[PDB]
Amino acid sequence: MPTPVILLKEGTDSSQGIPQLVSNISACQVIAEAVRTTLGPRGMDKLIVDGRGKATISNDGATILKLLDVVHPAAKTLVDIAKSQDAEVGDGTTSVTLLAAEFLKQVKPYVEEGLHPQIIIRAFRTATQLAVNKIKEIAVTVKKADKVEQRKLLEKCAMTALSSKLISQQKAFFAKMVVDAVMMLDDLLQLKMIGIKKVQGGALEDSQLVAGVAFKKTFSYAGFEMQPKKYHNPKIALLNVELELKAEKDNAEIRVHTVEDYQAIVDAEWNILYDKLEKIHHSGAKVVLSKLPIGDVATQYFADRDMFCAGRVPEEDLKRTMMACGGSIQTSVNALSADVLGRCQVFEETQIGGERYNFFTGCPKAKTCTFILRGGAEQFMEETERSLHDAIMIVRRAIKNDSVVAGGGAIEMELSKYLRDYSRTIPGKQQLLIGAYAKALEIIPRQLCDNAGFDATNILNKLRARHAQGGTWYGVDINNEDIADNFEAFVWEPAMVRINALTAASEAACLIVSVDETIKNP
Amino acid sequence: LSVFGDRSTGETIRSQNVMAAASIANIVKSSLGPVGLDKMLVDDIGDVTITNDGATILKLLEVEHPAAKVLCELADLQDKEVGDGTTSVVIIAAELLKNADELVKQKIHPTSVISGYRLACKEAVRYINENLIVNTDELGRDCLINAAKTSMSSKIIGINGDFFANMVVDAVLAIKYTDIRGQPRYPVNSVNILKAHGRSQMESMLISGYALNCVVGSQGMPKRIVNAKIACLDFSLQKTKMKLGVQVVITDPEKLDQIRQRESDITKERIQKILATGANVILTTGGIDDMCLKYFVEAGAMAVRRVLKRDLKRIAKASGATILSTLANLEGEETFEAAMLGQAEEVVQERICDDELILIKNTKARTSASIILRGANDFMCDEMERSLHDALCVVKRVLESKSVVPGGGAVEAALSIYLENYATSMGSREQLAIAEFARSLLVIPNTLAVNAAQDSTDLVAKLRAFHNEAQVNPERKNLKWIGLDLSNGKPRDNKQAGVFEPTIVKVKSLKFATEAAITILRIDDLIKLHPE
Amino acid sequence: YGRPFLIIKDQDRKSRLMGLEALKSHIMAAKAVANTMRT
Amino acid sequence: PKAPGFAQMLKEGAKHFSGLEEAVYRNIQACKELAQTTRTAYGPNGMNKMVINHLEKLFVTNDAATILRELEVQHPAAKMIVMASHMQEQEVGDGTNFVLVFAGALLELAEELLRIGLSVSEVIEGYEIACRKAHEILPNLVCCSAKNLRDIDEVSSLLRTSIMSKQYGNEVFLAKLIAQACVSIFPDSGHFNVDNIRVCKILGSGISSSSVLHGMVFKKETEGDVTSVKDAKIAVYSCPFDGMITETKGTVLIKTAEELMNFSKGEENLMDAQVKAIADTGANVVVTGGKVADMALHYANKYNIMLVR
Amino acid sequence: LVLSQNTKRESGRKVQSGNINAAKTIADIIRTCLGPKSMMKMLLDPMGGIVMTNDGNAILREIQVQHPAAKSMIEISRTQDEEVGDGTTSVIILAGEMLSVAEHFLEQQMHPTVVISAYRKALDDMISTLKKISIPVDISDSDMMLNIINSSITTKAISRWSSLACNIALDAVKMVQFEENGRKEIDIKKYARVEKIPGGIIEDSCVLRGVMINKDVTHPRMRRYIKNPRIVLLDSSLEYKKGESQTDIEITREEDFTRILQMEEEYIQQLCEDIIQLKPDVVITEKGISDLAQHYLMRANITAIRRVRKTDNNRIARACGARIVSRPEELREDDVGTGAGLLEIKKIGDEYFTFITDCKDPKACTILLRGASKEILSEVERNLQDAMQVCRNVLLDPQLVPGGGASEMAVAHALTEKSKAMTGVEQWPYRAVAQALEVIPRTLIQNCGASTIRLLTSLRAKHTQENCETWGVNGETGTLVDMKELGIWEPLAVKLQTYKTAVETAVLLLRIDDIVSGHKK
């Protein structure tokens, strides 16, 4: 019984062409609608719970999209870009997805026309590149100007940046925190240095920034409560090496006939720990830290001599600590000297939310701080941190790049107008693409007004008319609910954000449109 | 909170129906215009059906979602009102729905959208009458030739149309009929069409009369009658009944033979009474007994049993016969009159595709037209008649309305821009809907071009330009034009090309489309209910 | 065009409640909590 | 009915094909599928394509071989041509597209002559000799035998065609950077082996901001500080950075007390002396993939040396 | 869930190729079966029986499929078979191959409509071509018809028996001409009854000057042998038949019941004497026969047959020219069974048969098929069916065609002559169809098994000379042969619908773009 031979595996699914192509575009639109509401001064955030039952709220879509495990292929690309732009610049990743599908959306009818995607992407490259340069041209710096303190602009950017996520009512609060905090990050400039302490409870308005490090952590040993917990001007020891009687050291059997030698040996093992401790004590310092466990007894010795100690510490916070106090973490107790020995303005340790924390700050030269984040909801913490995270990295680039632009959709409206007139220059099939490129482009405020529940059409026609001649940074006000100089209303953005945004979107469709069929393997 | 099914509201259902409609559109998007490609469906068991007309396709398409069924039934109605535009009208429905939805998909108030659409249709048809072209001045036969072959395009038979349309136009002028005493109404579906696989449509023949999908009852009975002696009789011929309950009781056996005798003699004498008139052709939808068969052979007569009711009605109207449900008289005796006879030149049963079907030639009382179909398979004939079925209607409408519209999509080409300017008149927000109305209305040439598979926009753009030009320099007698082509992929004058369509087609099309989207657009929520 | 296509796994049982309906649903639950503790 | 006979039950369930029918029909069609599979593939106008593997991994592609690599095809002759260009790709690179096109076309007319009654063997020879003749006539069409070894401009203009075919959008950047790459590499290990090129993938910062380095990268962490010296003194050690533990199970043993002190103490000083002797050579960086001694890095920071991991 | 809930759909080139492929299969499965050197196929009916037959129609008529166009192709076969009988040996093989190249422009991105457009152009010239290269023939001359018939039948297994059938086919065909249509008399092949009886040999089967009945005398006393009998066709039954009005009797007196029973006796006898008054000899009826009357009709020594099938009664009536009667009292002597040269009832071996011979100028006749086994017989008559069918077509048109592919090449270059002179994009389709035509002689080569390519090129080269058009391909030698001496001659109309059907197939499948299943109604 012969059978006609299959080409590929049973159930190897494929679908080709426009019906294939258009389907993805729909999925993109489906994706966007999951995020359309999100960003905005009156924007939106979502909650998603896993199969494990852990709830998860978020306002930055990339996190949400990461939560939203896509099964479709082409949609993952959209998810992929979010991580890119999130790993690049932060919020507006929200908008970034809006960028793509809307770019997808307007061409989709032109896709119904049997247009070679290469044509479409050809303008897309043309449009983005031409768009990009105009961004650079109308970008705004301040260091040529005179009325900027090096942080005010950073201060303004975050307020702008912060004016979308869950702590929107306290932007004026945290903005100073992060800017002066980020003022410390020089010049490693990396987020790993600065810790975040998701301390439960307390009003987030009482959340703290310490010009030092605190420990959300500890562990109970015997005397760990007994010793003094105030050290007004202490000296800080950082040990990586553990402190215990040969708990986990080199493995060796020993052989001894004589009891006294047996006697002598066990005594000697102790003298080992004492000898380090003597080195520990005779250092004259008062605080010792260890990633490793510490013998309980030494604590008593430290308690007996009223020195503080702590073991099993996170090295990261220890890494902060050494980067905070300038002292050097040690593995050799004997080669110790005061040069590697940390000093701090004052050390303490305080109860916060019942939790047992360890306090030390005031180091004049400490390029690393930590964020004590009070808050009564578990979900708030990571959400805030994600908000906190974005705030830091975005201003970090701002520190890197003294280029700013107004927000409130003004930029895009300016672009759409510029390209709109430019489309008149270029005849033919490209011209239609340019307008739609502009026609997709304007969407961002429209959703904002949608998320404001306003009549964006009046706003848009007003805007387009008002953006015809009278001023560049005229843009939407949420509160006055119409056009405003959001720049003078101080809605200020780093160019790179939208710069990378549109470019990443540009390739996305250029990636997106460039496929004719799908193939599936079980 | 209702059991056995939930609900979804707003955009979710809103877009959902849009997704439903667009799905419907793409099903038929390839079978329209002179380059549309016809569809076929395996039923479930191989009794497949190839056809280009969506109204068939939709009617043969099972639907479960509501809104789509609206379109299918709507597709049916326009078919019941036009017959084609099935090529187009549903395509119009979803696309206008597509764009209108998109506006609301942002914020736009639906009722506002409805209102502009209301105006848009009224605006359109008024200008339609302001752009009309009349066929009265034109050569009657010529334009009917033109529109038919225009209608013959997109169909299986479009190559042979000239033969076909010529065949068709003769049929309708042969189906002339005097109406309410003031109209010459021309009855469609009155023409008889018989499908028969075999020879080519090259050999397909029109009957200057009627043709019967029937045979001679009696093999011994003669076959062809050169005379006009023709009757129809609804009254069946069997041994006459008691026909309600009337019992026959015998206490005196001596007359049962006489009883049983007359049982058939009644039928016999009825045979004799009608035969004595000398009638040579008879039909009876009722059953015909062999006793009658024998008698007619003795007459060498001609008779038919089980003829479909409508055709013999056409026969009586054709031959001038009186269909007779029975024999009677204003006096009680059942009598029969020669004046009841129908008359025609010659009647033959002829074996086409080895099957003898009966032909009627030239009834003198009322001229008749019927058409014999020849083709390869049964699949080909039953579809081509539908095109033929639609073929009649359009010409009938042209006869019905002595006025023409040029074919080949000029309509929206003119409409789009004229509305585009007209949109600016209102100053409201509805002109956007007007603009999308026009924008969505632009779909047809795009469908044409994709169905012709070339660069559509540029064709559209050129079509936009000349029509836009047709709205510049009001000296348009030498600036107003109309036309577009696809085979050569460039615009033309369909008026010169003869590419014409009936006005009523697009008229009801837009209106029926207008109503449909209105119905669909106002929806905002669906609720499911599981069965018992 | 119209035909099923797969986006997020278990999409049939991946239910989703949105907007005003969702919000009130929280409220009724919240009130349940509120009344549950009232005494 | 319901009971035909078999003259050879030789098979316990398998597919035996015969009568040339598969060859004349089934063999051809499968090939024709492959042509249809990748007909769109090549071309500056040819568009990319994506497929998911059996392990649900994304692959956007324009190169035939790679996507071909993603297809568990089961027709035997399918694989033949598949692996054919596969090695062909292994040999030259792009052309996979082309050869498959050659494949189908050569097949496509072949059955036609076979169906026309041309001898399969004679088909083979004629197909053979013509190819040989093609080789003969090929060289006489070379024009502009570009020669400049180490210019950027020539090859940039040259290599673009490969780029444009499989990327029509960004030729200028991509041309210069590989041209930047190619000119940067000279005949050192023997005439610019391809493997002498490394690639790093970093998300974000769209293609225009992609760059090329006259050095090499690692997307890995660090242990002490981060510095550059224009006179970089590097230490390289496939050995893991720690005291050389005997592969044999050699367990340190003691007999008396004072062993313990000196035991830990001595180990410390020797590693310091180990790293010191390294530091005295001025090597400001040591590199290894292997296991790293903790006090050593403690010493390494003490002498402020870079470590690689 | 939206559209039709698990009804599959497909569109475009994949559909296009799929239909292209299936027909390629569809034609292919039979390419072995045409030509005097053809093969012969035996089939399993689903319910157990066996049919062995070369005629493609029944083969395909005996084919179950799932893909539609095949079934679409199926009917096309049976339709032309119905209209023409043979060519089914070839038409479909023409058809798919036409499609086989027809696809070749699909990759040429040429819209099929034009390709159709050329086709309609192509056939027009083709029909015009054949009319130019047709040859009318006299119809009175028997031998050429016999030559034509063998020319028509030297393709099937009865080839060894050409002499018998040719006359056999001719004789029945000639004797069926119903002139009451003026000079528009028409023959019928349903009055051309065929009776297959196993046993005996092909040589024993013969044309009977009359009708054969698989029934027997109702009573022995009726003679089984008569020279010039008189025959009665009583459409009505011979017995007492219901008083149709739910009649009822209420007797009260004793003699009444016995009286009535005589009355039915009386009623029956009444019928008998009405029959005898015309002095008949033979009684035939589709219904039953009272033995009591049959006693009477025995008493009159008048031959009687009961419950005879109506079509045979007609042919029996058409045998002896008499007309059937349902009314013994209204029976008319103009329908006396006169026209009966001999009456007999033989014993075939376990079966009586009714022997009705030597009608004066009979119009109806049945052919008696006496062979080996009914499947053999059934195969024979199918070939007979084709044999007689073409003859009436010859009786329908006297214009003849030389086959053997000779005509095929003739158009082929003729269209090539048309092709080069018809500049445009449509030219390439035009020659392509001409390219399609060449396969049939080529196919003939394989069925012979010769060097097809060389012979074909030479034949085309042979047919490049205008001086010679009857050059075709011999069945057995596989050599180029002018037809005039070869004599394989064919009805022109046979070839017309052949191409007519062929091209119709092409267009119909070409406009397709889509598949829809699960109609559920």
Side-chain angles (χ1 to χ4, degrees), chain E residues 410-455:
Chain E
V411 206
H413 71 79
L415 316 181
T416 316
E417 297 168 16
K418 297 291 189 168
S419 75
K420 49 175 153 297
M422 206 242 310
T423 63
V425 294
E426 67 295 343
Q427 128 184 207
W428 322 100
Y430 226 67
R431 45 187 85 271
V433 192
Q435 271 71 101
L437 195 42
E438 314 155 315
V439 305
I440 287 81
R442 146 213 316 213
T443 61
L444 275 261
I445 322 303
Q446 298 80 93
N447 303 257
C448 177
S451 152
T452 156
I453 156 76
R454 156 208 329 162
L455 276 287

XYZ file of all heavy atoms in Angstrom, chain E residues 410-455:
349
model
N -2.038 18.085 -38.032
C -2.500 19.001 -39.063
C -2.912 20.329 -38.455
O -2.440 21.391 -38.873
C -3.656 18.372 -39.836
N -3.779 20.290 -37.448
C -4.099 21.517 -36.736
C -2.851 22.066 -36.072
O -2.614 23.278 -36.070
C -5.220 21.273 -35.714
C -5.990 22.563 -35.455
C -6.136 20.171 -36.201
N -2.019 21.180 -35.526
C -0.907 21.629 -34.701
C -0.053 22.631 -35.455
O 0.164 23.757 -34.991
C -0.078 20.431 -34.248
N 0.384 22.267 -36.655
C 1.102 23.236 -37.463
C 0.176 24.343 -37.926
O 0.595 25.499 -38.036
C 1.743 22.549 -38.664
C 0.760 22.112 -39.702
N 0.210 22.983 -40.620
C 0.228 20.897 -39.971
C -0.619 22.323 -41.407
N -0.627 21.055 -41.035
N -1.087 24.010 -38.183
C -2.028 25.023 -38.632
C -2.125 26.137 -37.606
O -2.056 27.322 -37.945
C -3.397 24.396 -38.886
N -2.251 25.769 -36.335
C -2.189 26.775 -35.290
C -0.815 27.412 -35.232
O -0.703 28.616 -34.995
C -2.553 26.154 -33.950
C -3.774 25.242 -34.049
C -4.119 24.670 -32.697
C -4.964 25.984 -34.638
N 0.240 26.627 -35.454
C 1.568 27.217 -35.548
C 1.615 28.218 -36.682
O 2.191 29.304 -36.545
C 2.621 26.140 -35.768
O 2.365 25.038 -34.893
C 4.004 26.703 -35.494
N 1.006 27.868 -37.811
C 0.815 28.847 -38.868
C 0.012 30.029 -38.351
O 0.365 31.189 -38.589
C 0.128 28.192 -40.064
C 0.946 27.085 -40.707
C 0.137 26.274 -41.694
O -0.941 26.749 -42.102
O 0.573 25.161 -42.058
N -1.063 29.753 -37.615
C -1.783 30.835 -36.957
C -0.904 31.518 -35.918
O -0.907 32.749 -35.804
C -3.060 30.304 -36.312
C -4.067 29.729 -37.290
C -4.691 30.807 -38.160
C -5.845 30.239 -38.970
N -6.663 31.293 -39.624
N -0.129 30.732 -35.169
C 0.585 31.267 -34.015
C 1.538 32.379 -34.418
O 1.461 33.499 -33.900
C 1.360 30.150 -33.325
O 2.504 29.815 -34.093
N 2.430 32.098 -35.361
C 3.402 33.104 -35.753
C 2.758 34.330 -36.368
O 3.356 35.409 -36.335
C 4.381 32.510 -36.748
C 3.689 31.786 -37.868
C 4.688 31.329 -38.898
C 4.173 30.104 -39.619
N 3.998 28.966 -38.670
N 1.557 34.197 -36.909
C 0.894 35.293 -37.587
C -0.018 36.075 -36.660
O -0.700 36.995 -37.114
C 0.103 34.761 -38.783
N -0.013 35.756 -35.368
C -0.980 36.287 -34.412
C -0.243 36.962 -33.255
O -0.483 36.687 -32.080
C -1.903 35.192 -33.903
C -3.245 35.719 -33.456
S -3.545 35.425 -31.711
C -3.166 33.683 -31.627
N 0.673 37.858 -33.613
C 1.635 38.407 -32.666
C 0.961 38.969 -31.422
O -0.125 39.554 -31.477
C 2.447 39.512 -33.330
O 1.566 40.577 -33.703
C 3.151 38.982 -34.562
N 1.635 38.799 -30.302
C 1.150 39.282 -29.026
C 1.520 38.301 -27.935
O 2.124 37.261 -28.178
N 1.140 38.665 -26.711
C 1.425 37.819 -25.557
C 0.642 36.519 -25.644
O 1.104 35.461 -25.202
C 1.110 38.579 -24.259
C 2.051 39.756 -24.099
C -0.331 39.058 -24.270
N -0.568 36.589 -26.188
C -1.433 35.434 -26.350
C -0.862 34.406 -27.311
O -1.340 33.267 -27.332
C -2.796 35.911 -26.848
C -2.780 36.504 -28.262
C -1.970 37.790 -28.388
O -1.678 38.428 -27.354
O -1.623 38.155 -29.529
N 0.138 34.782 -28.106
C 0.734 33.843 -29.046
C 1.276 32.619 -28.322
O 1.000 31.476 -28.702
C 1.835 34.551 -29.841
C 3.171 33.835 -29.852
C 4.258 34.611 -30.556
O 5.207 34.026 -31.078
N 4.133 35.933 -30.571
N 2.033 32.845 -27.261
C 2.663 31.739 -26.551
C 1.653 30.743 -26.012
O 1.892 29.530 -26.132
C 3.569 32.331 -25.479
C 4.206 33.528 -26.042
C 3.842 34.820 -25.835
C 5.277 33.556 -26.986
N 4.644 35.659 -26.563
C 5.536 34.906 -27.278
C 6.059 32.572 -27.593
C 6.543 35.298 -28.150
C 7.057 32.962 -28.459
C 7.291 34.313 -28.730
N 0.532 31.151 -25.422
C -0.504 30.152 -25.134
C -0.963 29.411 -26.372
O -1.159 28.190 -26.328
C -1.634 30.993 -24.531
C -0.961 32.190 -23.982
C 0.188 32.476 -24.880
N -1.101 30.117 -27.493
C -1.673 29.507 -28.686
C -0.821 28.341 -29.156
O -1.324 27.232 -29.365
C -1.803 30.556 -29.787
C -3.132 30.568 -30.506
C -4.298 30.943 -29.850
C -3.214 30.246 -31.854
C -5.512 30.974 -30.511
C -4.423 30.276 -32.523
C -5.569 30.640 -31.845
O -6.776 30.669 -32.504
N 0.481 28.570 -29.303
C 1.369 27.482 -29.677
C 1.385 26.402 -28.611
O 1.451 25.213 -28.934
C 2.776 28.025 -29.919
C 3.250 28.998 -28.847
C 4.588 29.652 -29.191
N 4.456 30.837 -30.039
C 4.454 30.812 -31.370
N 4.569 29.661 -32.015
N 4.338 31.936 -32.063
N 1.263 26.792 -27.345
C 1.321 25.814 -26.269
C 0.216 24.783 -26.408
O 0.447 23.583 -26.230
C 1.221 26.521 -24.922
N -0.996 25.229 -26.715
C -2.084 24.282 -26.917
C -1.763 23.376 -28.092
O -1.979 22.159 -28.046
C -3.409 25.028 -27.121
C -4.565 24.055 -27.041
C -3.545 26.118 -26.086
N -1.245 23.962 -29.168
C -0.714 23.149 -30.248
C 0.325 22.183 -29.705
O 0.323 20.993 -30.038
C -0.124 24.041 -31.338
N 1.203 22.676 -28.831
C 2.145 21.782 -28.174
C 1.409 20.686 -27.420
O 1.867 19.541 -27.373
C 3.054 22.566 -27.231
C 4.318 23.106 -27.868
C 4.059 24.243 -28.828
O 4.253 25.410 -28.494
N 3.613 23.911 -30.031
N 0.260 21.013 -26.831
C -0.498 19.994 -26.119
C -0.977 18.898 -27.054
O -0.971 17.719 -26.684
C -1.687 20.622 -25.395
N -1.384 19.262 -28.267
C -2.035 18.297 -29.140
C -1.132 17.117 -29.462
O -1.614 15.996 -29.655
C -2.475 18.986 -30.426
C -3.463 18.174 -31.254
C -4.485 17.533 -30.335
C -4.155 19.069 -32.258
N 0.173 17.344 -29.502
C 1.095 16.391 -30.093
C 1.198 15.107 -29.291
O 1.726 14.102 -29.775
C 2.463 17.047 -30.226
C 2.365 18.444 -30.804
C 3.528 19.327 -30.412
O 3.911 19.322 -29.225
O 4.062 20.027 -31.297
N 0.665 15.114 -28.076
C 0.895 13.988 -27.189
C 0.133 12.746 -27.612
O 0.631 11.632 -27.417
C 0.525 14.356 -25.746
C 1.284 15.586 -25.327
C -0.970 14.593 -25.614
N -1.039 12.900 -28.217
C -1.885 11.740 -28.479
C -1.178 10.727 -29.364
O -1.080 9.555 -28.966
C -3.239 12.189 -29.056
C -4.094 12.820 -27.963
C -3.941 11.018 -29.726
C -3.748 14.263 -27.672
N -0.649 11.091 -30.532
C 0.178 10.122 -31.253
C 1.350 9.680 -30.414
O 1.653 8.486 -30.349
C 0.623 10.896 -32.503
C -0.272 12.096 -32.572
C -0.625 12.417 -31.175
N 1.970 10.622 -29.706
C 3.042 10.262 -28.796
C 2.565 9.199 -27.826
O 3.173 8.134 -27.713
C 3.536 11.500 -28.055
C 3.983 11.217 -26.643
C 3.698 12.392 -25.732
N 4.051 13.670 -26.340
C 4.509 14.711 -25.654
N 4.683 14.611 -24.343
N 4.804 15.844 -26.276
N 1.429 9.440 -27.174
C 0.872 8.424 -26.293
C 0.708 7.110 -27.031
O 0.997 6.038 -26.487
C -0.471 8.881 -25.744
O -1.375 9.077 -26.837
C -0.319 10.179 -24.972
N 0.256 7.179 -28.280
C 0.133 5.973 -29.083
C 1.468 5.263 -29.197
O 1.523 4.028 -29.241
C -0.421 6.312 -30.467
C -1.940 6.404 -30.657
C -2.507 5.116 -31.261
C -2.657 6.743 -29.355
N 2.560 6.024 -29.253
C 3.862 5.384 -29.379
C 4.116 4.487 -28.181
O 4.525 3.331 -28.324
C 4.981 6.425 -29.533
C 4.532 7.594 -30.396
C 6.181 5.779 -30.164
C 4.063 7.195 -31.759
N 3.863 5.003 -26.981
C 4.166 4.243 -25.777
C 3.329 2.982 -25.718
O 3.838 1.900 -25.405
C 3.932 5.093 -24.531
C 4.805 6.321 -24.434
C 4.285 7.456 -25.274
O 3.536 8.306 -24.793
N 4.676 7.481 -26.542
N 2.045 3.100 -26.041
C 1.190 1.926 -26.084
C 1.703 0.918 -27.099
O 1.582 -0.293 -26.888
C -0.243 2.351 -26.395
C -0.777 3.364 -25.393
O -1.560 3.024 -24.505
N -0.342 4.612 -25.524
N 2.288 1.389 -28.197
C 3.100 0.500 -29.014
C 4.441 0.241 -28.345
O 4.895 -0.904 -28.259
C 3.295 1.096 -30.406
S 4.364 0.128 -31.498
N 5.078 1.296 -27.847
C 6.370 1.170 -27.206
C 7.539 1.432 -28.134
O 8.483 0.639 -28.163
N 7.506 2.525 -28.891
C 8.541 2.820 -29.877
C 9.289 4.098 -29.502
O 8.976 4.763 -28.511
C 7.940 2.936 -31.280
N 10.290 4.440 -30.312
C 11.090 5.638 -30.070
C 10.224 6.852 -30.342
O 10.204 7.389 -31.450
C 12.326 5.655 -30.956
O 12.727 6.991 -31.206
N 9.542 7.315 -29.299
C 8.494 8.308 -29.480
C 9.054 9.620 -30.006
O 8.516 10.200 -30.956
C 7.762 8.517 -28.157
O 7.146 9.810 -28.147
C 8.731 8.398 -26.988
N 10.153 10.088 -29.419
C 10.654 11.415 -29.750
C 11.017 11.492 -31.222
O 10.564 12.385 -31.948
C 11.857 11.758 -28.858
C 12.746 12.798 -29.543
C 12.634 10.495 -28.516
C 12.187 14.205 -29.506
N 11.809 10.530 -31.690
C 12.257 10.554 -33.074
C 11.084 10.472 -34.027
O 10.977 11.267 -34.967
C 13.204 9.390 -33.328
C 13.279 8.975 -34.784
C 13.618 7.513 -34.866
N 14.452 7.145 -33.731
C 14.648 5.901 -33.314
N 14.061 4.888 -33.935
N 15.422 5.674 -32.262
N 10.182 9.529 -33.783
C 9.050 9.354 -34.677
C 8.201 10.613 -34.704
O 7.782 11.076 -35.772
C 8.233 8.142 -34.236
C 8.679 6.754 -34.718
C 8.371 6.579 -36.200
C 10.155 6.472 -34.440
